[PDB]
């Protein structure tokens, strides 16, 4: 598959077994913190409804996304193996139009 600025993480959680309030905000912060070791994030969306446990990410550049996908794919997260896969830029922008103009690097919500 061809590398792009965007990718999807899968198997990050099971929404049916997530009971704690603001659990998706904690997942978001886990992804931002981990991608700061690479090139950062400009857009993130935690899918609270798919059983697959999907997280959508947009990096500031294709190089930043390659660094993040290579480092995150096949990792353990909360005792489960996660998959990282590229998302074509028109597919990502159709899902998240507000990500088209995103430029600012995201900061985690928690300390």
């Amino acid at each position: 598959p061809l590398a792009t600025q965007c990718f999807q993480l899968s198997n990050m959680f099971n929404p049916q077994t997530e009971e704690e309030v603001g659990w998706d905000t904690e997942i978001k912060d886990d992804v931002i913190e981990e991608c700061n070791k690479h090139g950062g994030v400009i857009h993130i969306y935690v899918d609270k409804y798919s059983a697959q446990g999907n997280v959508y990410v947009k990096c500031p550049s294709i190089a930043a996304a390659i660094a993040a996908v290579n480092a995150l794919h096949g990792r353990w997260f909360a005792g489960k193996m996660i998959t990282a896969a590229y998302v074509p830029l028109p597919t990502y922008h159709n899902l998240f139009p507000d990500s088209m103009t995103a430029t600012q690097l995201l900061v985690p919500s928690r300390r």
Binding site: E26, D30, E34, R75, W76, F77, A78, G79, K80
Partner: peptide
Amino acid sequence: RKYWDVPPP
């Protein structure tokens, strides 16, 4: 909080 690189129990 530790979830990254945590293998199954």
